[PDB]
């Protein structure tokens with residue numbers, strides 16, 4: 001119950017919301033059906049529209065009007081935004097030449113440049129070029145300020161998960177808004193776009209920017225706007241708040257537009273009906289900038305123009321129906337659309353079985369347009385698993401398609417032509433970023449980056465310490481003229497041992513054999529030198545990775561590769577080697593097919609054993625440094641050391657062998673040499689973070705050899721490919737992957753074909769950032785380069801996406 005008999009007189013769009021059942025006058029009261037009786041009359045005036053006209057200039061103030069053209073409006077802070085243009089002969093901001101904003105030019109009483117975030121729903125990255133003729137204000141912000149060609153949203157590429165990621169710097173699995181619809185089984189509560197449950201604070205985790213600001217004594221405008229407040233009024237409200245006394249005035253504001261997403265769903269992303277929505281958003285930007293210019297703040301405020309996600313062509317005839325696959329369709333609940341999430345309809349149904357659901361959905365139809373996954377098997381770059389609100393079964397839907405439970409769901413819920421939510425590497429889902437202001441650079445293009453990085457920068461713009469988040473703070477310093485954040489590299493926690501030869505061959509009883517009894521004073525000195533690190537500079541190009549947790553490990557040197565070998569996990573944490581453009585691929589010799597060799601530097605008690613692999617009928621082994629790429633017949637023996645072996649299912653060895661035999665050389669040819677760092681990852685609790693030894697769910701049978709959930713590689717080369725990877729004087733280029741270590745290849749529907757038809761496609765799906773591998777391993781890479789640390793942080797956040805341009 002709300003006592004709406006109270007009044008909004010002198011309270012319109014008040015910043016703090018008042019306590020029920022007292023009636024409200026803030027920008028959210030409509031959504032709660034709780035505004036005072038006179039909120040429309042007082043706070044949503046529309047009389048005479050939004051624009052001054054010649055005849056209104058110097059009018060007698062009429063408090064009924066939506067906005068004012070009377071002489072006193074500039075001191076009241078409520079002129080129509082075009083007041084000075086119409087009445088005082090000023091120019092629109094868009095018609096003024098771009099002039100660099102070298103320092104903030106602010107009115108007295110401004111303690112810091114305010115931040116205004118202008119967020120637009122469904123604003124696809126390619127609109128910046130494709131719509132540029134009809135968006136002159138947005139085009140000026142973009143050309144004059146700092147802009148990226150696009151900004152990568154988070155998955156799923158839905159509205160609330162992405163806007164809340166902008167607010168928090170967190171992945172949706174961490175902030176809790178994991179879709180536009182959700183069931184939380186602990187709460188036993190459902191979140192929906194429509195209605196009231198979504199306002200309950202227990203959905204919204206982390207700490208959004210407006211709370212970060214408030215806790216640190218920086219005041220904030222509200223970021224939510226009730227949908228029925230027109231945009232012109234949202235702009236006038238922000239401009240009014242900017243005229244508050246210094247002690248009352250917020251420093252951060254957010255405007256939101258439901259367009260162009262609203263029309264994109266109806267008309268598709270490039271429907272001819274889309275030009276008008278884009279012109280209308282441009283006009284709104286123009287209102288803001290003219291209004292800032294009136295207030296003399298257009299060279300004071302930092303403006304962010306940012307979108308949540310793009311928009312794809314999706315029509316009802318491109319719908320896959322689970323009723324075409326599952327016998328049991330009424331025993332499941334599906335969250336449908338551009339992604340699928342499945343759970344049991346009833347928790348009391350003992351016949352429900354996820355394994356049989358997955359199998360029935362796996363590669364059943366030739367052009368099948370979705371792929372099922374247990375959530376722990378989804379590409380790690382999505383970071384979409386570690387939340388109870390995310391159903392164990394997930395469907396990754398192809399761009400341009402929907403998935404639904406039954407045909408009747410599509411016509412008893414087809415005029416819609418656009419949608420979004422797909423994999424956040426899809427080109428159509430990319431969205432926009434422009435920053436304009438004294439704190440941003442002038443006429444500067446920056447590379448694409450992920451929206452999870454923006455919170456930290458917004459905190460930097462406001463002089464706030466960010467709450468703990470998933471951005472990499474410093475990775476976007478290149479967007480800024482000032483206020484950069486200058487991080488120090490993390491300190492190394494464990495230092496390595498450097499073992500020499502300490503064990504005789506007969507101390508090892510590992511059940512291994514190798515045909516290696518096959519032999520000089522020229523050659524003997526050189527082998528000792530290699531084992532002491534004499535080639536290390538060739539193979540370890542960016543320093544040893546630092547281990548950021550407490551553990552016991554050894555550095556092992558070899559002619560062709562260097563490794564950091566964990567005594568705890570019995571295998572390398574990392575294996576680093578360089579392959580020049582000229583390197584030759586060789587085979588594993590017939591006499592060496594099953595060769596595994598004790599490492600006389602590492603005790604038997606800290607080694608793997610071959611007998612565990614013979615006994616484990618499901619598990620085989622591979623090597624981290626590939627024997628195919630040995631520099632010489634003699635150096636090849638090093639590749640079969642028990643310290644270079646790792647556990648691999650046979651089905652995974654098909655992937656791994658193709659990568660090592662064919663792809664590494666192909667990348668070295670293409671990129672003019674590569675440096676490779678490969679290793680295992682253990683993330684049995686799918687939290688994106690390195691497991692401790694006690695979290696490991698599976699071991700090679702009979703042994704203490706832990707089985708990795710994934711295998712990674714980081715492939716680095718020179719950005720200027722005229723220079724070889726090992727002699728690069730400038731910026732680097734990287735691509736990386738985190739391949740799932742699975743016992744079948746059911747994810748790849750073409751896997752019965754030759755590896756050349758499916759393996760690289762698998763690897764591309766599981767592309768990763770170096771930062772993702774760092775979280776998963778507790779390793780810190782690139783510690784010794786010639787590059788600035790901020791540039792290296794940007795390199796670590798890079799994702800090679802494989803989409804066209």
Ligand SMILES: *[C@@H]1O[C@H](CO)[C@@H](O[C@@H]2O[C@H](CO)[C@@H](O[C@@H]3O[C@H](CO[C@H]4O[C@H](CO)[C@@H](O)[C@H](O[C@H]5O[C@H](CO)[C@@H](O)[C@H](O)[C@@H]5O[C@H]5O[C@H](CO)[C@@H](O)[C@H](O)[C@@H]5O)[C@@H]4O)[C@@H](O)[C@H](O[C@H]4O[C@H](CO)[C@@H](O)[C@H](O)[C@@H]4O[C@H]4O[C@H](CO)[C@@H](O)[C@H](O)[C@@H]4O)[C@@H]3O)[C@H](O)[C@H]2NC(C)=O)[C@H](O)[C@H]1NC(C)=O
Pocket residue numbers: 170171173174175176202203204205206383386387388468469470687688689775
């Ligand atoms: C992306 O960035 C984020 C932010 O930095 C990273 O997330 C952090 O990860 C940390 C490790 O996973 C984690 O630290 C834990 O915090 C526990 C206290 O948590 C509460 O308080 C904080 C602070 O305000 C709050 O933010 C938390 O918010 C979560 O939960 C609420 C309510 O459920 C949600 O609204 C919110 O969305 C958020 O949910 C997300 O995180 C939780 C985990 O906290 C997940 O369960 C959800 O699925 C969702 O992802 C909390 O309200 C603290 O109690 C933990 O300490 C225990 O475990 C450690 C193990 O190291 C041990 O040292 C301790 O002894 C202790 O053990 C005891 O409890 C165990 C578990 O019950 C039990 O098994 C033991 O036997 C012991 O009794 C732990 O320190 C931190 O909370 C999150 N923060 C956030 C905001 O998500 C994230 O890792 C980054 N991602 C990547 C890939 O880098």
Ligand SMILES: CCCc1c(OC[C@@H](O)COc2ccc3c(=O)cc(C(=O)O)oc3c2CCC)ccc(C(C)=O)c1O
Pocket residue numbers: 028031117119160163164166167168193194195208223224225226227254255256
């Ligand atoms: C979502 C987090 C907050 C946030 C931002 O929210 C802006 C906020 O007005 C968006 O709210 C929306 C958006 C769509 C719909 C609907 O389609 C339907 C319905 C309904 O039927 O009720 O309600 C909606 C609401 C709720 C109106 C209270 C914007 C930008 C940011 C940034 C930049 O951080 C940010 O954090």
Ligand SMILES: [Ca+2]
Pocket residue numbers: 682683684685686687688689690691
């Ligand atoms: Ca983990």
Ligand SMILES: [Cl-]
Pocket residue numbers: 156158178179180181335
């Ligand atoms: Cl959803």
Ligand SMILES: [K+]
Pocket residue numbers: 613614615616617618619620
């Ligand atoms: K085996």
Ligand SMILES: [Zn+2]
Pocket residue numbers: 122159261262265420
């Ligand atoms: Zn939408």
